[PDB]
Design a protein around this nucleic acid. Structure first.
Ligand SMILES: [Zn+2]
Ligand SMILES: [Zn+2]
Length: 373
DNA sequence: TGAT
């Protein structure tokens, strides 16, 4: 058992170091909890270890490098086989560690590595963004720690003394922000079947209510809109869960959560979202609140379909339009743009579904009627 | 809390 393989850390050491507030100052140390397993994952790990290292002065003593050195000697003492390794790390890898791990993974086909991170370290700096992409390209699976992973880390690596994991405040909100930020910097592309199923604008017949939202930013430069290549990606609604958001968090709200986190300066910005469902009343109300308190942001909403929330969605769309949002139904050019930009198309061109233009026309006339009532 |  992992309790016999490692010295479990103090609960205060865990909670202070793994708190997932995205901006968190004062932490002088990186912590790394790991398991080494066979290709069969269910059974107990072959070994488990806790590594720590000061962030400064030298990356060579970061826990990622300590792991690599330990693992290399450990493998000499054990019969060779394929290994799946899991890390729970308090900070994501710096540029030096990301490159060393990437080089190790790239030259060893027998090792597979998954890294769950509590916080993203310097996620806004291009050097760190690039290094995480290099690591992902070497085959490392990078994810944000969620409730289940904090709970698992607590059970395995912490001297909890039988007490259960207790989540800190805003663990879910932090997770969603970091998860969207990670997908952004790794340039995650949306699955093509997922795109086609969710942005098809024919009358909806599935029992599923899910919302996918693609977003982009432009900057005003010399009375011209220029792309801002930094903040481009997609996200989806968060389904309810008592350990996440008990009543869910809709895509439009998760989108609004990102904007302050980008730390846009005082220049004029146009933020565009392509959302498979138009926002419900509560989403459009929060969107209207945002516009009114962020006047350097011009909001543009393109929707594939109009969502009837059985409530005040028509008033919500009217309020959003009057407060200055541009609201429009997606036409062929916007579907093609999202396919070309946000979808893992593997070079394949946009293949429009039957009736795309006719459905866009009917929906545009319905939107027009809503906004003029 | 934008974090030697
Ligand atoms: Zn490092
Ligand atoms: Zn909504």
């Amino acid at each position: 058992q992992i309790r016999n393989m490692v010295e479990p850390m103090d609960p205060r050491t865990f909670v202070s170091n793994f708190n997932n507030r995205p901006i968190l100052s004062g932490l002088d140390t990186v912590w790394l909890c790991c398991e080494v397993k066979t290709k069969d994952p269910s059974g107990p790990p072959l070994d488990a270890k806790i590594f720590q290292g000061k962030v400064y002065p030298k990356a060579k003593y970061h826990p990622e490098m300590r792991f690599l050195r330990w693992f290399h000697k450990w493998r000499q003492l054990h019969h060779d086989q394929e290994y799946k390794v899991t890390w729970y790390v308090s900070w994501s890898p710096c540029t030096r560690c990301a490159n060393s791990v990437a080089t190790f993974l790239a030259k060893d086909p027998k090792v597979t590595l998954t890294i769950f991170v509590a916080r993203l370290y310097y996620f806004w700096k291009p050097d760190y963004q690039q290094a995480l992409r290099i690591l992902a390209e070497a085959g490392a699976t990078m994810k944000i720690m969620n409730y289940n992973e904090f709970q698992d880390c607590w059970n395995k690596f912490v001297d909890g003394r039988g007490k259960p994991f207790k989540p800190w405040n805003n663990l879910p909100k932090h997770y969603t922000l970091l998860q969207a930020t990670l997908g952004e910097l790794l340039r995650h592309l949306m699955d093509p079947g997922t795109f086609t199923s969710n942005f098809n604008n024919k009358p909806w017949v599935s029992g599923q209510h899910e919302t996918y939202l693609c977003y982009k930013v432009e900057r005003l430069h010399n009375d011209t809109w220029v792309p801002l290549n930094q903040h481009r990606g997609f996200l989806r609604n968060q389904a309810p869960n008592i350990h996440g958001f008990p009543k869910g968090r809709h895509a439009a709200l998760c989108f609004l959560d990102l904007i302050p986190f980008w730390k846009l300066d005082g220049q004029q910005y146009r933020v565009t979202c392509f959302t498979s469902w138009s926002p419900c009343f509560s989403c459009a109300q929060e969107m209207a609140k945002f516009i009114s308190n962020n006047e350097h942001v011009s909001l543009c909403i393109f929707a594939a379909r109009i969502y009837d929330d059985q409530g005040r969605y028509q008033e919500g769309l009217r309020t959003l339009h009057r407060d200055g949002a541009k609201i429009a139904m997606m036409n062929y050019s916007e579907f093609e743009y999202c396919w070309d930009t946000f979808v893992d198309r593997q070079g394949r061109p946009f293949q429009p579904w039957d009736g795309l233009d006719e459905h866009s026309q009917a929906l545009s006339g319905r939107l027009r009627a809503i906004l003029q009532n």
